Point group: D2
Chain length 436, copies 4
């Protein structure tokens, strides 16, 4: 029977809580979703509602586009939304393992993006560490992760990066020096970062993990877009094994190709991760969870695994093509072998004329429908939530050159690289011709 | 021309930023949505993406159900999502005015539910008031609003309510006594509440507003489900006129009949409300905004206004039917004329036998597909985030009786009341027969 | 259990094959559709296809919009599409009874519109009556019903209508005179018509039925848009009781408010109706059947019955408003009490100036977004499939005046009448002002 | 601008009426569809309707799933549906050329399946040839094409096929012998067939075309599933060049992977093809046209061309795998090099035991979710619409053996062949073990 085949797949999902090897057909998926939504009281045919939160919906466009999941995630009032939440977190745990953190103990989807999800971690740790006022943070010029600390009501302690060749790396001496200066009890946590813009590289998590274990200080990893990278994930896995990592947080959109809106908070200590979940007040949107559930069931392990493999290949393709273009314009690819996602070519040939050529190149790429490229000048001064950054965008006060960023992130296609290379070549020609 | 008629409506929305008098046809709405999504870079036909957040989508089910809005709300990378956000906040401001707060200066949708949205207000006020550690809070037995204070890292100062007849009301003397005891500078804010479970009533906002203006302390109003009530909204409007209200927060789902997930933060001081918006780190889900935009454009002013009128009528219908049932079972409707949404009938005839009959009645209603009713016993002890509540569910340590809650909230139908009355009558009969 | 409630409704549909009293919720309907489509082999998860008609679908937009019903209607290859067809025909039979033909024996949806469905009836009757070459047809100026006879390969025998007051009615003497002239065996059938443009009225079916019973000649009724009228349906029911009706055919779109595309063929002799079904070669589109199934399950008996009641009320409203306008312009409503759907006001005040004012009025209404009105002049000569019609549009060679048609058909709203009246008034004023 | 890029594609479609080289994104397609539907009067915001066919829709599920195309295909009342029809027929003409008939003059989508579309051709030819009563038809055991002739009211003249090796081929002598016997004027047309079940092969169209040109008799080609085959299409193209072909008809579902429901009628004489279109009475469903428009715009030339290439490859794969299996069971692949889509392996090893093993094998494959296979026994007697077929299913009275059919049709995947081979192998083993 056709129906039994669908039920077999559903039952296997419910009993194991694992991503199916092969992606489900849409037919199976929509059957499952409809049966789940049937379990929510708002969808009961015999229901009457006499409360203030009945999951009533005025617009049929709204109800249908959400598969009639209205109540969000948590006698129960929403048994299907609850099961949706359970399944999705179970699927996500298994993908975390698949992706490289095999010892992960616990995780949960939270329908806030990565910044606010990090804030939630910091808000939870306040009650663990009432004496703490500082968060030690190796510098990365990204506004949201930096603001997350201020939002949580702590003061960031910005640790400048060390220039090693072309790469910007964790200053481990300065981190330990600030712990000793300020006092371990006054530090809320170390806030490290994996995936980042080249020529910065993922933080030295093993070493920071050792430092945190020894000084007895929480370690929170901004893994925003590092789940897609088995190298970034090995760094988390190794760090947890050789020292201390308390939580790692990753974006749903950047690693799973779904709308912006949600993140995953994961860790190795189940009671602690539960404490973060419990620190969240009230119901939350089920929409990020639904998007990731749809995506993971449709892809299967094999589909997600293939996406990860294709990204590695696109990275190789992107670097070989960008290095070739760079060199053809008498530029070079910065040597950043410790960054597995992001790369940078120098813009020395257009910089230095005092005509804003580097910024102009960025705008030119933008108006030619190139998105995601970052033209980083020398000398941006920018103040973010109380803190003034010298050399903003470059993660250092005095990086030796201007450069252009590009990145091979999950779902990148060959036409992404090809069109980029084509339009970048033309833009470089225009600028240089203008400078004569 | 047919197309010009659609464009006229769209252009009028864009130029005035106001809810159309009559609801748009779905045809107009979907035209508009598709044209908006066209403005996001991920949807550009000529686009190439070389960054880490390109709004790529693996699942067609996911992309389509969100109308291809992927990037969430904020060179720009997402011009349509940005315009969506602008329009929606403008529509919401106008509905706030429509609903009873005509002097509202500023507001924004935040894709967190009401609890976390209140937390965000408290997180913002931390930077305004570094010496503050306390939030003064007239008691309401609702976990999320209470937890919001703890999550923000403040300690709640629980002010017990005064029993006046059957109603539980703001103890204004105790509020002022705690301000003086603890010191104005050590108070982060007063956290009041409008719409609530009977026999509690909306807080005395005019008087609290006067107190807050005089002691120079912020006033944050939990208006979770009070937007649907012109009486609750008059209380906010009057309070702002005679004293101080800094922010008022309301649920999207409870006032607009959309999925759980979002809230509105509004106020009378534009710079301050902007500061709360700016305290939020990173991008956020556009899904709550989209749901409310769809809903408000489809309803129009006239449709939303009609929903508000129908709720008032359903309240009258619900109370007349519940009073009639109560009296037929030798119970009574508690006299709560200061609560415009929630009501309560006594359960004295089944309580007092030491057999858990009140709790049992609640479960009986639940298993008979009645949702939203609250059977409140005498004597619940419950600890929430560090604080132990006596008489939990009843908003007081010694409320004189057990009672049952019901409420006429927006979108309630006559069959909601009728089925409820029918099943409640049968349940009361069963319990009483059992007690002989 | 929520799911059991849905299954109860489905099971009741499957066991009785009758329209539910109250409309199904969309949730129940889509559950049912998905479960049905599961029964088609193309949707089997374990299926392999090695034939030429496997129901493969390239476009996900196409597959989804049809609920994955691909195979159309008929070891079996399509068990769900087959069950869909069975259910839909059973629902339609019951609506035919509801609508006024309680003795209907058999019917089937055919995914051709009414013209081709009549052709199919004529094609079937060819094999019953090999000597027949003529179809006797009381005149109605509608191209499709007339062409249906030619398409079938018969020659129409056009019987002119009798003017009785303002109405055009069946010339029963001329019908019988042509039977006798041509010979009963040489007549394939009588092709009568119910719902039609005023001032024509439904054919005299009782009398024609008696004639057909006596001369032993098939009687095929064009009931294109007469199902929505209990008066038109009583005429079919009475005619079948007092004489002979072999088949009656009605449009799906005009009586059920669904896309153009399908029709119903019904009758009182089950073997004969089966013969028409069997005369159709090959598979056919399931789309008309699906549309009517969705519509009838969502409406229920009560919803469809309410639509029929509202149409009667709109007819009264339309005539009272049109009579009032007519008289205000010194025109009159033609006295057509035997037409229950269509009406006509005279255009004598603008006609007669030899300036094409009547045609011009029709175009003016069209450019002012009035659809469905017919401005009928005196003196249209028009040739349709070999036959030249004098006074084309007016169903007679010498109807005494020009007039304007309007009709109250199912789903008409008060704003349809109101806007029509408003724009018609303005148009009449413009024309008369021009004629000075 | 993003919007201009979409409009450029649309404008190019409208000006050239040709399939885009590369498939449109869904975004572009749905934009286009929505803009088209805007042009139909039922969708006009300012519209009032006072007629009997206003395109009103009761169900939002129905309206939305058809993109608000309600009126079907034809002052005008439906300008967008009309343009839809125009575009689709233009796209289809170009695909006919792409597929191998480069000299095609005219074609149109008709929303009837292939059988009824052939009937329409025969119905049209009746008026061209009033003396004709016969249709000469080389035998193919397919019920719908045979019934199409009877439905049209003609008598089929069944020409038995000639056995050449393993193939069944056109008996050209018998065709000419029947023309001479019955008289050219009494023949309505020759009804030939291209794509068919092996071991029958496509009719000898060049030779039949010469015969038809010489005797002055119409030639109607059943090209039901031959459009997907450049060899079948070359036969039509060559036949038209060396002789007479008046119309060729093909299934939409079998060549374009859309629901059953529609067909294309094409030819080389534009006035004649127009005459067939004009012989159709009334409006018709736009749904088949919409499905093929969606499909062709999403695929582009390149996508459809790739599908055709993949089918050729799947044919090679299917035959090599089926030949290998056959031989492993001491059977053989029948030598049918003139059939480019269908193949047959002998079932001699299980046939001959008088135990219905051949029929049983067919049922076994069916219950193991193999669809589209045909187990053809020796000796089926079956009467279809008045005519008794000896050896029904095998296209001859005395085909030497029982065999099994399989076919590589458009959209076939490797798993279709692989699973089929796997399950067929197991079934053969079961049967042979049972026969000991």
């Amino acid at each position: 029977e056709a129906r039994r085949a669908h039920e077999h797949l559903i039952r296997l999902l419910l009993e194991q809580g694992k991503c199916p090897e092969d992606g489900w057909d849409e037919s199976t998926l929509e059957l499952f979703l409809h049966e789940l939504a049937v379990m929510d009281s708002n969808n009961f045919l015999g229901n009457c509602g006499v409360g203030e939160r009945e999951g009533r919906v005025a617009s049929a466009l709204v109800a249908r586009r959400h598969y009639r999941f209205i109540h969000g995630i948590g006698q129960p009032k929403a048994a299907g939304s609850s099961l949706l939440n359970k399944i999705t977190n179970s699927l996500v745990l298994n993908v975390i393992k698949l992706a490289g953190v095999h010892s992960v103990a616990s995780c949960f989807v939270v329908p806030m993006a990565t910044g606010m999800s990090l804030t939630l971690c910091f808000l939870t740790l306040r009650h663990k560490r009432p004496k703490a006022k500082y968060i030690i943070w190796p510098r990365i010029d990204q506004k949201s992760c930096f603001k997350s600390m201020v939002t949580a009501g702590f003061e960031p302690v910005v640790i400048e990066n060390v220039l090693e060749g072309d790469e910007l790396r964790t200053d481990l001496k300065a981190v330990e020096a600030k712990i000793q200066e300020l006092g371990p009890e006054h530090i809320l946590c170390l806030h490290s970062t994996t995936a980042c813009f080249a020529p910065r590289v993922p933080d030295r998590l093993e070493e920071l993990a050792v430092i945190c274990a020894n000084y007895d200080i929480p370690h929170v990893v901004n893994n925003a877009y590092g789940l897609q990278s088995s190298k970034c994930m090995h760094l988390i896995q190794q760090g947890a094994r050789v020292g201390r990592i308390d939580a790692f947080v990753q974006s749903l959109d950047k690693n799973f190709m779904v709308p912006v809106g949600g993140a995953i908070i994961a860790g190795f200590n189940e009671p602690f991760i539960q404490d973060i979940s419990k620190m969240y007040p009230g119901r939350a949107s089920a929409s990020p969870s639904l998007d990731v559930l749809i995506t993971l069931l449709s892809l299967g392990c094999s589909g997600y695994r293939k996406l990860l493999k294709e990204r590695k290949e696109m990275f190789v393709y992107l670097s070989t093509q960008l290095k070739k273009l760079a060199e053809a314009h008498n530029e070079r690819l910065l040597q950043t072998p410790h960054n597995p996602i992001s790369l940078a070519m120098t813009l020395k040939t257009i910089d230095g004329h005092h005509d804003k050529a580097v910024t102009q190149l960025g705008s030119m790429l933008f108006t030619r429908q190139v998105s995601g490229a970052r033209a980083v000048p020398l000398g941006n001064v920018q103040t973010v939530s109380g803190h003034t950054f010298r050399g903003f965008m470059s993660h250092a006060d005095n990086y030796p050159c201007a450069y252009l960023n590009a990145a091979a992130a999950i779902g990148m296609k060959m036409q992404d690289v090809d069109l980029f290379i084509k339009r970048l070549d033309k833009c470089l020609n225009i600028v240089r011709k203008e400078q004569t």
